[PDB]
Amino acid sequence: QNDEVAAFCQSIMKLKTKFPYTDHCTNPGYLLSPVTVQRNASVKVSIEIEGLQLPVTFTCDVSSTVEIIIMQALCWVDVGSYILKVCGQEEVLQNNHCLGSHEHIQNCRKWDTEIKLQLLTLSAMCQNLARTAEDDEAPVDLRHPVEELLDSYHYQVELALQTENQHRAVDQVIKAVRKICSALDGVETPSVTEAVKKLKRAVNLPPENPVQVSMDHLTTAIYDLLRLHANSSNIKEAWTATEQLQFTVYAAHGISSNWVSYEKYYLICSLSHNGKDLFKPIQSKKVGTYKNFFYLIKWDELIIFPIQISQLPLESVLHLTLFALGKVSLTLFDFKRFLTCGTKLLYLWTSIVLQVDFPSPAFDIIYTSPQIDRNIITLESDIKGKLLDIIHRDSSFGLSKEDKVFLWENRYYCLKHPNCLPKILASAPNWKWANLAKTYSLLHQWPPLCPLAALELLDAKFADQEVRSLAVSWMEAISDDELADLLPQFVQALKYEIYLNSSLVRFLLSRALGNIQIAHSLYWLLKDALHDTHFGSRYEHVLGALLSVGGKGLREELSKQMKLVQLLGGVAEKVRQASGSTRQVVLQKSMERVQSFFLRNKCRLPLKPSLVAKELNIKSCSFFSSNAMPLKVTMVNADPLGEEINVMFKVGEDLRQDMLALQMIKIMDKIWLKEGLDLRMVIFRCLSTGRDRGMVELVPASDTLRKIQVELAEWLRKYNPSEEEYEKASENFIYSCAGCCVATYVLGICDRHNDNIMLRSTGHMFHIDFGKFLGHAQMFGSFRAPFVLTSDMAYVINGGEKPTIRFQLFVDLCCQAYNLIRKQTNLFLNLLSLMIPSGLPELTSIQDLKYVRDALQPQTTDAEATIFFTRLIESSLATKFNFFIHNLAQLRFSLSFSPKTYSFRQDGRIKEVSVFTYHKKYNPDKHYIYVVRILREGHLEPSFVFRTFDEFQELHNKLSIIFPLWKLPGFPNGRTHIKDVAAKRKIELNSYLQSLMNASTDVAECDLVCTFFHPLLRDEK
Ligand SMILES: Nc1ccc(-c2ccc3ncc4ccc(=O)n(-c5cccc(C(F)(F)F)c5)c4c3c2)cn1
């Protein structure tokens, strides 16, 4: 453990060299203003400049870079020294990026607020975060209780040398050993047990004495126990070793008195590679409790696994579950690729330490990768024309096993499409050592693929160190700005690294050192990720490495933010206590502790670190009247240019779900305006600051549909009086609502009522609550409304209670958005998949991802999808239309009347078959069902099945594909009556069956025939 941690710490010290504090690029000391490249105007900008009372105000064209805008400003009053920052926000604009790229400018242009920038030199910029010379210079880090017990042991041995009273002295020796074991988590190695029993016997049995030699064996056995407990400090290759994988589970040490009270204990042993087990788990023998010094659970059972060491892949790990008291996991190869050998002491937690003895040969077995093939590589049509359809496939989910085997065979012909490599690697048949030569030699010549698509290669299914490393190598093509918004997926992807010092963690630390915003985001994500029981330890280690590398300035700022979070936590929790008028008083009394630490502590806002705070505005700060009792905190800005900071802070409810929902919506808007569709969406942030509590970005001049109801078109009219301004404010409503519609369906957020739908003064619509964000199955399976579009919301669409051209436009926008998200189904699925391990409710199963995919209809053509979504909108506006759309949506995502196939070897052969009688049925249609009498071989009692003439027709047509028409009997083809035709068809079908079961043995024993006569729900009663 600590040897792996030392290696990790060394590699961190190496990583710090490429980021010296002297380089301003890697260590600016300030946040950069996040930018999103938008496809396809001028606006007014006020730029503060040094020496002038009033800022310079002028119209600045958006296309122009920031550099030329600085040069434009310099005219009214060193080139590299001047930079532009946002007024009241400690975030600097990008130098070589256009103005309308930055989130702050685009937010300002959608909101319609004055752009306030400040031109200043790098010297004048606050850099309290900048990593100093001491930080860069310092080492990376993340008292001894047994020394005295060893001293006492050696002293008791020195006294034992006196032959006056040997027995006496030896007793105090043995007692010393007891205390040592008790201190070492209670671990008594069998070497010590045998050494103490040998000592007792060598003392009782009177150039060496028997007491001296047996005591020298004690010392040896204790120091060997220490070597194992600390786990600190002739080479055969792994693919040579033909030995079976085996180890000897010894005992669990330092057991509590409460355990002896559970009758018997046993372990379940599993071996896994890319997440899924390799073989059925192996149980251990059930044993009670053994006693020598302490109470233990002695097993001493060899466990052998049906594979050789050669077969073992590098990333293979051994799981031992205790009986579900605790689960331990051990990597069969260490971080240095040496195969686990000798005794191993594993740590388990309950409401403790497991000794596992691995074979310790004289020679150390190490694992090594195969050499590179270096082949470095003929086109054939039709098969190509078809293969292109399989590379066109959305993802690896929409692939049949036959498609996978066909794709893997035409492997080297897909070198012209890098983004399908996850489809190839998920279509790889085997993961054997000999086949790795081919795959690795392919990957090393494989052209780098889109970093968004490289997320897929970071899931558990692609847990090969070389694949992961290449994935991380290709990931270094994204902007930090694009990364930050994907960062949580990467934090959860750290779970699928068995070794601490992964490529992934190195990349994340590299990016965190290059950008404070990334480090800031990583901090809160790793903080909430510590709540994991298993990966807790790992996440502490990567967070500790981030803090130690981030410098004293950054870490001290984050420590400030942490205490601010904890104080506001305690305040918000005190409001849940009181439901009287007293509640409003408890805010001010609880504020004593909060405003006190603000004295000589300019803390940054955890939700938006660019904002700095001095103190609170008691008059402004109020509660929120719901069930969670959230608090809006109005903090005065430290920069007098900046406006007051309104932020919500919630306790009791889990925000992890909200965060994921909002990240999805943000990425939807991103990919929308990445193609040139700007549905002017409302993007509000949210930060899980701990355990079911965190900060929420507040939206000014916005209320829910309940508060507007108690007072819709009149609300917007109040804020936009002019009918000119009103129609322009309604245009915003159409675009925002459309974006909300496509987001609500595709995500499967169904629980849409007046309280979770919200509108702002400008007319932009946004959803706030995401309790059941991924509840797709509830919407599909049962009759939960996919989207709610109120008649009032239809009134807000230009034209009141009238068919309008603007509604057809709205539909066109909805359809265009739907298609644009359908093109990126894989990205959405990969993001959700990586966020499964978080333990978020409604995202636990792969089926949840499949449901999203089925709701996205990626196979369907854009035009057919637009028809589907238009008829969804038509529904949203009677119950009859809603139920019809429900039936067509269910039928779309989905022998006919018997899905499951059955053979005569399961149900039992048939002796006699006749059509007993015919029954008339009106439901669903006015048809005739026929009661077929079946007598099985050896069965006394006759069964019955009920089959309609259409269910017979299907069978005759199904059998005509395999068997010829001359071998099968003729099927019956107006006159008489409907009852007389049914009465004659009875006898004609009875003649057809008799002729079918006596034609030949191949026909009468076909699997379709058995299936046709198989019991179903229509047959049973
Ligand atoms: N899960 C959630 C719930 C609510 C919000 C949310 C976000 C921004 C707001 N911006 C402005 C306003 C203005 C008046 C206002 O009342 N709210 C608001 C709406 C619903 C619930 C609450 C709550 F009780 F939970 F605090 C507050 C809000 C806002 C509520 C975010 N996430």
Residue numbers in the entry: 4 to 43, 49 to 85, 93 to 157, 166 to 229, 255 to 281, 293 to 320, 322 to 383, 405 to 432, ...
Text lifted from the article:
Phosphatidylinositol 3-kinase type 2α (PI3KC2α) is an essential member of the structurally unresolved class II PI3K family with crucial functions in lipid signaling, endocytosis, angiogenesis, viral replication, platelet formation and a role in mitosis. The class II PI3K isoforms PI3KC2α, PI3KC2β and PI3KC2γ are unique in directly synthesizing PI 3,4-bisphosphate (PI(3,4)P2) from PI 4-phosphate (PI(4)P) at the plasma membrane and within the endolysosomal system, in addition to synthesis of PI 3-phosphate (PI(3)P). Like other members of the PI3K family, PI3KC2α contains a PI3K core that consists of a Ras-binding domain (RBD) and an N-terminal C2 domain, as well as helical and kinase domains (KDs). In addition, PI3KC2α harbors the C-terminal Phox-homology (PX) and C2 domains that are unique to class II enzymes.
To determine the X-ray crystal structure of PI3KC2α, we embarked on an iterative process of construct screening and optimization of various forms of PI3KC2α from different species assisted by hydrogen/deuterium exchange–mass spectrometry (HDX–MS) to identify disordered regions. A purified mouse PI3KC2α construct containing a re-engineered internal loop sequence and lacking the intrinsically disordered N-terminal region and the C-terminal C2 domain (C-C2) was used to obtain the 3.3 Å crystal structure of PI3KC2αΔN+ΔC−C2. The overall structure of PI3KC2αΔN+ΔC−C2 comprises a large compact multidomain kinase core that is mounted onto a helical stalk. A conserved feature of all mammalian class II PI3Ks is a sequence insertion of about 100 amino acids between the RBD and the N-C2 domain that is absent in class I and class III enzymes. This sequence folds into a unique stalk-forming HBD comprising four helices. The compact core region is flanked by the distantly located PX domain that is stabilized by contacts with a neighboring molecule in the crystal. The release of the PX-C2 domain from the catalytic core may thus indicate that the obtained PI3KC2αΔN+ΔC−C2 crystal structure represents an active conformation of the enzyme, a hypothesis tested and corroborated below. Consistently, we observed the PX domain to be displaced from the kinase core, and closed contact I involving the N terminus of kα12 to be disrupted in the crystal structure of PI3KC2αΔN+ΔC−C2. Instead, in this open conformation of PI3KC2α, the kα12 helix interacts via hydrogen bonding of H1391 with the backbone of a short helical segment within the intermediate section of the activation loop. Torin-2 binds to PI3KC2α in a mode similar to mTOR.
